[PDB]
Every structure is written in C-alpha cells, then in structure tokens.
Symmetry: D2
C-alpha cells in the first residue's frame, strides 16, 4: 500500500521522538490504507557549519528509535553515513536510508544491502533520473530486494533546487519511488551557516507528486518547527500532518486511474 | 471560476486543418460546459531554429482562417504576435493576444497588445524567474490590459532541455491568472539540430501535476496526426486523446481544489 | 585585427557619447593593432520595469552616433529591435547588433542582413553553443557576409548567468566570436526593478576570454557608472579602459600561440 | 609563490603505471623548477557509476605503490580518502589528503583528514556554490588543518553536463588556496550510461582560462594511453602532451599575473 515516511528530521531527544511517534501512531490507526514508517536521523553528518547540531550519537539514537518501535509498533527508518553503521542500525531500522550526497558510494550501498533490510536511496542533487538505474543495480548486486529511490530535488543554479517531476515515471522503471516533500523545497546553504527553504511550497508540490504518481511520500514533521535544531525552515507542524495525508489520499484515489503503465 | 483550456494546432498549416481541429474543440466545449475553450494557432512561426523550417502562410491568410473558425464554431480565438504592428489587425479576430516566450520583455510588443483592449497572455520566457513576471504584468496594466495571463512553459535547464518548476504557479498567481503550457514544457529546444525535439510521454503526467498544484487554465496543442505536423511535431497531442486528457484534469482539479492555497 | 567594441550602454545624451568617444579615439590612436568600434543603444527595448530609462528615440540616437562617427572617425554599432529599424540604422551603423532575447527572430536577422552591413548576434541566454550554427545560416541566407556571435552568458538557475567558455571554440567553427565582458556578469532582474551584476568579475573573465581565444571583446564603459541610467552595476569606469585593453593585448600575444585550429 | 601542479594517472591501475608516469613527472619537475609537483592517483574509485567498473587493488596495495613513487622519485604525494578510518594510514605517505567532490560536506571525513597534520585538498562538490566553501574551510581549520586547498572541478548544469563558473576562483581565494581540475571539469557525468563521458578537446582552452583568471595550482590527470585507462578514459591527458600544457600555463600565468586582483 501507499507509503508515508514521516518524523522529526533529527533525534533531538527521545522525548521529541515519542511525541511525534504518538501522533503518527494515531494517523496509522486512522489510515489503514497507508503504511507509516517513522523516520529520524541519529546524526546530521553533512551540516554546512561545524557549529551546527549533529545529534547524540548512534547508540543513543538507535536506542530512542527502538523505544518508538516497541512503544508504538511503528516500522523504522534512519540514514547511515559510513559502512560500519549499517549492521548496528539494521537492528532497529526496517528501511536503511542512503543520504543524497552519498548515493554513489558503493560500499555504503553494499553495506546497507547486506543487512537484509530494505534500502531507500535519496537521489543525489547531481544525478539525472536515468542515472539511478546504476544505483539500483549496485543494491541488487549486494542482495537488496526491497529498493526505493527518493526524489528530493535537483541542483538548479546556486542555492536552489528544482523538482523535475519527469523523474517519477523514469525512476519507476527500476524501483519504487518516494517523493521527499521536505528537502525538495529547501535552499542549500541559503542562510549562510544553514540551509533555507520555503514551507509554503511543500503542500503544493506534494499534491503534484501524487497527481503524477509515486509509491510513497517522505515528510518531516515537528511539534514546533521554528525550534527544530535542524531543517527548521522546511519541517511541517505536527498538527498539519493529518490534513495533508488525507489530501494526498483523495488526490491519489482519483489520479491513480491515469498513472501510466511501468 | 471557469477553467480555461487553450487548444489547437501549433501552426495554421491550412484553413482546413483549423476547421478539422475546431470541430472537435466545439464538440468538447458542448460536453465540458464548465470549461471556457479558446482556439489557438499561430499565423507565423517567427522564431524557428532553421531558415528552412515551416513558418506559415502569412498574417492575412492566418487571420482569415481564424475568423472562419470563430464564425463556424463560435469559439474564442488566440494567436501570437511578433512585432508591434501586428497587434491591431490580429486584435480584430483574437480574443486573447499571445506574447511569445523570447519576447516577454519587449516593452513595445506588450504595450501594443495591451492598448487593443483584448486579453493578453504572456508566455514566461525560459530565462525568466517566476518572481520577475511581476514587472511584466505591471507593464501590461500600464498599457491598459484588464485581463492578463501568465503561461508556464518551462525554464532553461542545461543545454537543449527545459524543466518545469511548479513553484512558479503559486508565485505568479500573486499578480495574474496562470496558464500551464502542457506541450511546450516537454520540448527539447534545438534537440534535433535543425529542429527542436520533445518527449510526448511526459505531457499527461506533468499536466496532472499542474492541476494538482493549481492553475487557472491549460494550454495544449493538438493535431490530427502529430507525426505530420509542420512544427512542434514532437510535442503535439493526437486530437483523439484530447477529450480524455481534459476529463482527467477536470477530475483532478475538482478533488484537489479544496486544498488550493489562498494568495 | 583584434576587435574592441566599447561605449556607453545607452545614448543618455549625445554629450555623453562625445566624451566616451573622445577617450576611445585616443585609445584607437594608441593601439593601432586593434580595431575599435563605438557602441551605444538608441533604445533599451527590454527593461524589466516600464518605469526605467529607455532612450531618446531612434532619430536622436542615429543623429548622435553619426556625430561620433564624423567627429572621431570611429566605426559604429547599435542594436535594432524590430525589422523596420534596420534600414535607417544602417545609414550610420557599420555593425548591426541583434539583442540576445531576439537572436531567433528570423525577420530581424534578415532585415539586418539585407542592409549589407555586418551583423553581430548576442547569443541568447537560452541557446546552446551549437545552436548558433542555425543563426549564422539565417544571416548567410539573407546575404550577410561579415557575421559575429557574441558570448554574453547563459541562464544558470534564477537571476544568474554563467559563462561556459567551451562556447568560444564551438561558435568559432561558423563565425567570428566576440566576448561581452559586461553583460556576462550581470544578474538578470537581480535588483527587482532592475538587473544586478558584479563589476569585480569583469576583468578576470575578460582575461579568460582572450586566454581561451576570441576575435574580439565587447565592453561597456561610462565616465561615472554609478550615475549611468542603465546597466549601472556592470559598466566600466572610462578611466580603467586603457589598462584593461593593454592587459588583454599582452595576454593575447602570449596565448595566441596556443589557440586551437578552426 | 610556487605554482602547484597536481598530476598523475586517475587510478592506481598498477605500481608499474605509477612509476611510468612518475618518471615523466620527475623529469618535468627538474625542468620546471618554479613549480611544485605533486603526484596523484587514487587507490580506490569508491564512487563509480557502475558496480562493474574498475575500482582498484585496495588501500594497502595503493599506499605501497604511492610510497614506491615517493622513494624512487622524491615526489610529494596526494590521494583521496573515502571514509574516516582511511585518513590515518593514507597520511603515512600522502602529503596532501584529497576529499572527493560528493563528500565535501561530510564533517567526519574532513575532521579525520585535518587531524593528521597533512595538507588537505577539497574538491568542490558539483552541488556547491563558491561562497558555500567558506564553511568547508572553517570545518578544516577547526579540525587542525593549516594548509588548505579548494579545487574547482565543475558544477551541475542540466543533466550529464558540468559547467565551470570561473567566478569561483576569486571567490574561493578569499579563504583558501585554489586549484583548478582541468580534467574532471570537462567530464560528462553518467554521459555513457554505465560510465561517465568527457570532452578532451576542451581541457587545454579551459586550463588557459583558469591561469588567466588566477589560481594557485592546476590538477590534471595524465596517462600513457588514455584510451586504455580503467577510469576517466575520456578526460585523461596523454602523458606526452603534459610538458607542453605546463609550459603554456606558466607562460600565460606570468603575463597575466601582474593583473591578478588582491583579495
Ligand atoms: O545547511 P545546514 O543547515 O547545515 O543544513 C543541512 C541540512 O539541510 C542537512 O543535515 C539535511 O537534512 C542534509 O541533507
Ligand atoms: O526549434 P524549432 O523546431 O524551429 O522550433 C521552434 C518551435 O518549437 C517554435 O516555433 C515554438 O513553437 C517556439 O517558440
Ligand atoms: O533589468 P533592467 O534593469 O531593466 O535591465 C535591462 C538591462 O540589463 C538591459 O536593457 C540590457 O542592456 C538588456 O539586455
Ligand atoms: O561515472 P564513472 O565512469 O563511474 O566515473 C566516475 C569517475 O569519473 C569517478 O571515479 C571520478 O573520478 C569521480 O569522482
């Protein structure tokens, strides 16, 4: 069924994770037609500034995620940054996430594939839709069987990303496609020491993604985005999550009739 | 508000081609009564890549052909102008005067269109940012236009390729009604060397995106046999697929509409 | 010999034209190895804002240019915007300039070609280097024999232009190539009601143009750029013109040894 | 100040290939005494497009091969790391630790390199704006690096193409020494499907541009027979053309130098 990956960008505290996890569990009970997957990063390994928030470590993060998985029975997904992290993260993560900048790092991909878990790769901002065919092949080579490719924007001049929706049908030829509604509107390093983004475009582009056709949506949410330690400009208020999910399910129900074959 | 659907053959290859397409557009206007149809066709392709490509049969012949369509089917008309002098005559038959993409910054052309009292639809230049359209609309208001449209037809993305940045729809809606050109948006500028190329397979998906995001109309060129078109042969929709595409976007629009943001 | 097209962006007054023309005449006498061509627009037909400066008309402009041509004996070049202007402008203009946004408008090209004058086309920001082959062909078709193609930047995201120097050798296959050092660094509609630009990059990129190899340089200059009515952000101070010309001639003398064939 | 020339075969195909190229680089270092030569070659291509493409013979073998080059020719050495653990061992032989383009934002990799006391050269990511390199340099200074380099290797321009925005050279010079990668800049990412393509014919002209603008060094991969390279076969310079290219850029640099701006 339709996939909805959601949660706070970073594991700011396992307390925050339980709050968001609670709301996601509720939506999970309300939308049985949807498969929810809780997402959160145990470490922001690519911040622009050395002085920005990274996280509390892999140990504290895997622990907090497991708490969410046991307390709410929600599947989990977090991203790895170096080959060694794959195995420990697989203990809890149902889906292992490969960062966009790292989408061509063979060993990271193979490490993830080896865990036997499902793998979701963020399409690099420097990658062409058709170039993702090779990414999928690496994973298959490594034994991955459940592979996802996530659209999250493409380099368009400086400090800007554009979403070429032509990629959704193109990538669908070799993998399930997920649309990242949060990072697609951010402005890389836009604020100097941080990245920007325009929240006002999140919903409009998400509606476009389902109208075009995708297997799932990725959307980061936080009780108080403004206070978020990371991706503050683009995180969605927890309270708006329900309305957007219902909205995309309705659009999908009608649009699906026209989704092209293969 | 009534949804606008601008459709027709890219170029006025002949008065007969126009009546052929017009007949189908008239049939559809009868079924889709919640839609305002506008018949489009250029009397001249003044910007072909090659000197050897088809241009047209002239302004005189073209306007005559468009008038025939309006009289026989009672359909509104739109066509593009290329130099200021053409505004006046074209305004005699055109309900909406279209301003080519490459020309969206030419002050005199915009002014010439504006003073005719007709509606004006500006194709957003491939070099223009969405927020730069505010001044385009200002120029038109200054020249007297009361009904203004801004059309999204793609932006330069590397060489011989265009990308559609859907953030442009809500941005431009701040100062004008917004039209999405479903056919030129999948065009590959100069892609075939002496001609431009295109990917027909992406027309429908992107048009669904456009209506899900929210726009006031769609512009899509159609032709009985796209393969034989004298222009835009790679992006023109087969006339028989027109009805289905329209039904589909009216359906996606309806279900999405309640979520369109207020500007 | 090496071509140097220079002058004030717009004909703000024939007074301004005579001042700049005087300095250019002096450089002309000092650099006999160079062919100077005085440039100025009788009308800015594509301003972003309706409230910006356009000019004093085609009559007043052609008159002022002729004054420069007679008083200093300098060849002339100005740009046309609609087909009818070609003939009258040819009376004075040795080289007719085709605006970048208008580089694919067949009739404008043919009108210019018909005058028997030389034609210089600004490569559209939306055009690929190889796409200029067709532009040249239109002109030849129209009877033009002295054809130039000017590099002036390419659309790179929003409100930004990038100079792909690969274009210089590519366009050279079918026409003489001129590098526009002034418009290449401007930021389209950058100031909202006007375009921006960074003067600090003009000289560096001009040095690159001659190191790569081009048949000429196009450079706008003004006694007091800050007061210029158009392109204020990118116009070069008249006083710096001599030093830059000498600089490019020296770089060209050494570099020319390595300019690739054809 | 001494001009830096980083050259060598893209990948350590064998210790013999290295000695072959090293021998010529040593001969050239003897002639061009005003130049500081640094021998480059990767012990691993950790980011190939295809799983079936050549990667290398391992870190152990590679470092052993690079050491042989340093001992036999007395040349400085540089090679890239892909994960933090590799910094320490690689630092035993590498004078300059290179950080791959796609990895220019990975904090731990940068930190690992910085704490070795070796010089660090960061390839500017194809997704990074020139002004965004300031934080990259800050991270390195924070981790202990005292000798830092930023390499220009092109920016994403549409699909499967890169463009070099020479404005990056003076911009980046504000916080670090600047190197121009003459070979990867003409590369066509994923251009050949399972491999990347490239246009060798543009290497020389763009390198002339780089030195005319002003930079502190050039990075150019060379190989006895580019056509047979196991990687970057499309952008690697034939070893015999190396000498001429270097002479030419030293000449253009000299004549242009008096015009280089002060930052
Ligand atoms: O530019 P800054 O603010 O460090 O932001 C980096 C974020 O955008 C980052 O961690 C994001 O989730 C990266 O992919
Ligand atoms: O590049 P060619 O095929 O001449 O095409 C130009 C057309 O696509 C053109 O007339 C289009 O309708 C231009 O705006
Ligand atoms: O954006 P504004 O300030 O109107 O500027 C337009 C100038 O850049 C313009 O006339 C220039 O010489 C156009 O090509
Ligand atoms: O796309 P392929 O040919 O695998 O190439 C990747 C190379 O060009 C690569 O290793 C280059 O040296 C990457 O940064």
């Amino acid at each position: 069924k339709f996939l909805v990956i959601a949660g706070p960008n970073a594991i700011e505290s396992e307390e925050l994770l339980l709050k968001v996890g609670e709301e996601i569990k509720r939506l999970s009970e309300k939308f049985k037609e949807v498969e929810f997957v809780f997402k959160s990063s145990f470490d922001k390994a690519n911040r622009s500034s050395i002085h920005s928030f990274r996280g509390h470590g892999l140990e504290y993060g895997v622990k907090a995620l497991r708490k969410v998985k046991e307390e709410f029975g929600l599947k989990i997904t977090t991203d790895i940054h170096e080959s060694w992290q794959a195995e420990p993260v697989a203990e809890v993560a149902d889906i292992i996430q490969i960062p966009a900048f790292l989408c061509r790092q063979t060993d990271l991909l193979l490490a993830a594939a080896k865990t036997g878990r499902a793998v979701n790769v963020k399409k690099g901002q420097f990658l062409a839709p058709w170039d993702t065919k090779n990414v999928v092949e690496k994973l298959k080579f490594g034994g991955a069987k459940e592979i996802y490719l996530t659209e999250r924007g493409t380099t368009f001049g400086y400090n800007n990303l554009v979403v070429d929706f032509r990629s959704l049908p193109i990538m669908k030829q070799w993998a399930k496609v997920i649309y990242d509604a949060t990072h697609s509107v951010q402005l890389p390093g836009g604020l100097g020491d941080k990245s920007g983004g325009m929240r006002e475009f999140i919903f409009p582009l998400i509606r476009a993604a389902v109208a075009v056709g995708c297997d799932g949506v990725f959307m980061e949410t936080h009780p108080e985005p403004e206070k978020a330690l990371s991706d503050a400009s683009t995180q969605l208020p927890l309270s708006q999550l329900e309305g957007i999910i219902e909205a995309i399910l309705e659009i999908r129900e009608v649009a699906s009739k026209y989704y092209e074959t293969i």
